[PDB]
Design a protein around this ligand. Structure first.
Ligand SMILES: CN1C(=O)NC(=O)C1(C)C
Ligand SMILES: [Cl-]
Length: 371
């Protein structure tokens, strides 16, 4: 089981695609809901995502069919298409997924934020970094629901530098476009969802706290955080969850005026990557870094909850730390940071000490020596 949110609000979930093209926005929205009797949200909603996971693993296509049998009926605790909780302006997080992931795989984070009164737009990237994604060739294809699938691109060593940088830049543009879409829906613009779903987007009119915007993301998504901040000053702060820094161009490092929080796993990080994080540091800039003891790269993603403790540890989905323990630390330290740099009037400052890594399961800064 993916955990329920720790906050006071019930959580809804829906999907939005606008426009219907490979250049439009695709996101999964998590939001405070008025109702708690809706069916739970299906975690991985299409067979092609399992085919794509199979390619990311470097296994045969039919392993996809096996992952689908294991995981294809699994839900996540958000009320599917529930009405939005009325009568409150909510801050907004745009969330960026890792390499091989897609929009639905960070629901433990998305639900937890939504239960505390955030609207969360988990983007699906069309840069071929997702295991799989889809869109429609034209208006006719959208109407009849004829999906076109786009699968993970494998790179040669020669393509690594250049293409990862092309992708992080597309990802940042995708974060900015998703923000503009939600802000336009907030400011009442009629948008016909390319997905025929029983959630009226009109509910979202006047529901966004328009200056209370943050960008969060994991791994490739954590580089997307940094690129997005350097390019779009509508985002007021960012949180990079175990950022993979390789995609960034040399130019971005000196160009991030916004507060930025690095939340790291113990076992992922390495000197080349830490040195790049430290290049984001300047005396005028607000920077924080914590490391979760006993944690692995995948502790930030939902697959840390999808298997048993022992198989989990073998597959590197789980660390020595308990997964609910680890994600609670990451989500609570995130909430305190967002409260600080978005100027929220909530009780999230109860977790201020976690930003400083002052907890038995936290390391202040990094365990990585860079000498
Ligand atoms: C770059 N990556 C990412 O974004 N997620 C992952 O698991 C790896 C490390 C492949
Ligand atoms: Cl790891």
């Amino acid at each position: 089981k993916i955990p329920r949110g720790n906050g006071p609000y019930s959580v809804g979930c829906t999907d939005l695609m606008f426009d219907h093209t490979n250049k439009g926005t695709f996101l999964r929205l998590y939001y405070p809901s008025q109702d708690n009797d809706r069916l739970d949200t299906l975690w991985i909603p299409n067979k092609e995502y399992f085919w794509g996971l199979s390619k990311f693993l470097g296994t045969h296509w039919l392993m996809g069919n096996i992952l689908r049998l294991l995981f294809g009926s699994m839900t996540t605790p958000a009320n599917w298409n529930s009405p939005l909780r009325p009568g409150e302006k909510y801050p907004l997080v745009v969330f960026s997924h890792g390499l091989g992931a897609f929009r639905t795989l960070y629901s433990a984070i998305g639900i937890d934020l939504a239960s505390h009164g955030f609207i969360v737009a988990a983007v699906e990237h069309r840069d071929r970094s997702a295991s799989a994604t889809y869109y429609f060739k034209d208006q006719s294809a959208a109407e009849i629901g004829d999906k076109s699938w786009l699968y993970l691109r494998t790179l040669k060593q020669e393509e690594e530098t250049h293409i990862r940088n092309e992708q992080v830049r597309q990802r940042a543009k995708e974060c900015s476009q998703a923000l503009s879409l939600i802000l336009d829906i907030d400011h009442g613009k009629p948008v016909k969802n390319a997905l025929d779903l029983k959630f009226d987007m009109e509910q979202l009119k006047d529901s966004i706290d328009r200056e209370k915007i943050a960008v969060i993301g994991h791994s490739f998504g954590g580089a997307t955080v940094i690129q997005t901040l350097s390019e779009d000053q509508r985002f007021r702060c960012g949180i990079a969850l175990d950022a993979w820094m390789f995609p960034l161009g040399d130019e971005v490092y000196s160009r991030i005026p916004q507060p930025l929080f690095f939340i790291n796993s113990e076992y992922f990080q390495y000197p080349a990557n830490i040195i790049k994080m430290k290049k984001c540091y300047s005396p005028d800039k607000e920077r924080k870094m914590i490391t979760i003891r006993g944690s692995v790269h995948q502790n930030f993603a939902d697959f840390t909850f999808a298997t048993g403790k022992i198989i989990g540890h073998m597959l590197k989905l789980k660390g020595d730390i308990d997964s609910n323990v680890a994600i609670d630390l990451s989500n609570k330290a995130s909430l305190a940071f967002l409260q600080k740099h978005l100027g929220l009037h909530k009780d999230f400052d109860q977790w201020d000490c976690l930003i400083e890594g002052d907890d038995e399961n936290l390391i202040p800064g990094t365990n990585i020596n860079t000498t």
